[PDB]
UniProtKB/Swiss-Prot annotation:
Covalent lipid sites (S-palmitoyl cysteine): A287
Residues annotated as binding cyanopindolol: D90, S180, N258
Membrane topology field: Multi-pass membrane protein
Full protein name: Beta-1 adrenergic receptor
Post-translational modification: Homologous desensitization of the receptor is mediated by its phosphorylation by beta-adrenergic receptor kinase.
Coiled coil: none
GO BP field: adenylate cyclase-activating adrenergic receptor signaling pathway; norepinephrine-epinephrine-mediated vasodilation involved in regulation of systemic arterial blood pressure; positive regulation of heart contraction; positive regulation of MAPK cascade; regulation of circadian sleep/wake cycle, sleep
Single GO MF annotation: identical protein binding
Name of the gene this protein is made from: ADRB1
Gene Ontology CC annotation, any one: early endosome
Entry's localization field: Cell membrane; Early endosome
Shown part of the complete sequence: 33 to 358 of 483
Bilayer-crossing regions: 8-36, 46-72, 85-106, 125-148, 175-200, 215-244, 250-272
Cytoplasmic topology ranges: 37-45, 107-124
Organism phylogeny: Eukaryota, Metazoa, Chordata, Craniata, Vertebrata
């Protein structure tokens, strides 16, 4: 009964998790292979898209598999070091993602308001430095506090979990909860929204065919930004609400919002099918 039920559950979740992993990895490798093999998709903006696809790829190859083994098997099987490395990679990927989205918004703002200054200022070498900087800053605010144990609580519940090698709950003190949320998420969220609204306004104040084609690409970028926020904002809101009251949102919806967050990593490849050029590159590559 209990043994038959767990065998049905384990088998069915293991399949669902495989499918998620496959969709994230196939979809983002396509985005990277498309850009890497299509001279027409090799715009500076798409270098940032590639960076974003790497963040999602790392979620597919490392973050989600590990998290699946946890959801499926009902414990952490890989020891305390890997538990921390895994959390680190989790925080890294969300941080790098939202920071990259921020850079993309800024890139477009400059492109739209000062096309000429942009032309000369913005080159491939600089696009690469920009990308490395975002990963540097993300690595900095992700790994270091986590390997320093700045996130740990002394709660009775927190201390239980820390000793137990089967527990890889990211149970953190309130300071870290607020600090890391603000630094990894909310600040770059606010920047991205502010700059995105400015790019909207500038698009509205803006031959005719070329403008509708540009605008369609902008709206694509708008969509990946909006979906990212929808996918992660709930998690991070619940993260703050927990600091003030552990009992206002049930654990299950906190775990739900966590997976909704991971689910975002499978979405961009699909959204990029709004572009003829991406669509054609995807069809050619799947051969
Ligand atoms: C285990 C964790 C820490 C993974 C860390 C991975 C990063 C080091 C990856 C993520 C995004 C990658 C970047 C994504 C995009 C580019 C653009 C790329 O420009 C190109 O020359 C190729 C495209 C072209 O110009 O045709 C140079 C590599 C670079 C900076 C990559 C360098 C390595 C990065 C930062
Ligand atoms: C590094 C740059 C980009 C960010 C600059 C923002 C900081 C100057 C400020 C803005 C809000 C401040 C935070 C506001 C609230 C908190 C929660 C605060 O309260 C507690 O956690 C004590 C509660 C408890 O331990 O029970 C800990 C400091 C912290 C993170 C503050 C740290 C300093 C912050 C991040
Ligand atoms: C998260 C990895 C952190 C990535 C850190 C990259 C910083 C180094 C970049 C660099 O020195 N060149 C590019 C040259
Ligand atoms: C990038 C974010 C960096 C977060 C900075 C965290 C430092 C504050 C840590 C701290 O105050 N404690 C954990 C440090 O050991 C102890 C208390 O929180 C205690 O009541 C539980
Ligand atoms: C970035 C990503 C975070 N995560 C998002 C996905 N689940 C793991 C944790 C947290 C959690 C607390 N602070 C965070 C900062
Ligand atoms: Na533990």
């Amino acid at each position: 009964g209990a043994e038959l039920l767990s065998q049905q559950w384990e088998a069915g979740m293991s399949l669902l998790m495989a499918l998620v992993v496959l969709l994230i990895v196939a979809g983002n490798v396509l985005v990277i292979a498309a850009i890497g093999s299509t001279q027409r998709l090799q715009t500076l903006t798409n270098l940032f898209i590639t960076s974003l696809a790497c963040a999602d790829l790392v979620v597919g190859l490392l973050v989600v598999p590990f998290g699946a083994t946890l959801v499926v098997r009902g414990t952490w099987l890989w020891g305390s070091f890997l538990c921390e490395l895994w959390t680190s990679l989790d925080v890294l990927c969300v941080t790098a993602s939202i920071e990259t989205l921020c850079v993309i918004a800024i890139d477009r703002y400059l492109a739209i308001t000062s096309p000429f200054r942009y032309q000369s200022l913005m080159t491939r070498a600089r696009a690469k430095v920009i990308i490395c900087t975002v990963w540097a800053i993300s690595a900095l605010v992700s790994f270091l506090p986590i390997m320093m144990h700045w996130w740990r609580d002394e709660d009775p519940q927190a201390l239980k979990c820390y000793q137990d090698p089967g527990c890889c709950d990211f149970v953190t003190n309130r300071a870290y909860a607020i600090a890391s949320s603000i630094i990894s998420f909310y600040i770059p969220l606010l920047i991205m929204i502010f700059v995105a609204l400015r790019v909207y306004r500038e698009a509205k104040e803006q031959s005719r065919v070329m403008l509708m084609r540009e605008h369609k690409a902008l709206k694509t970028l708008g969509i990946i930004m909006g979906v990212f926020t929808l996918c992660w904002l709930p998690f991070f809101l619940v993260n703050i609400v927990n600091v003030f009251n552990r009992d206002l949102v049930p654990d299950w919806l906190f775990v739900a919002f966590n997976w909704l967050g991971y689910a975002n990593s499978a979405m961009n490849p699909i959204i990029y099918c709004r572009s003829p050029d991406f669509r054609k590159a995807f069809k050619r590559l799947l051969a």
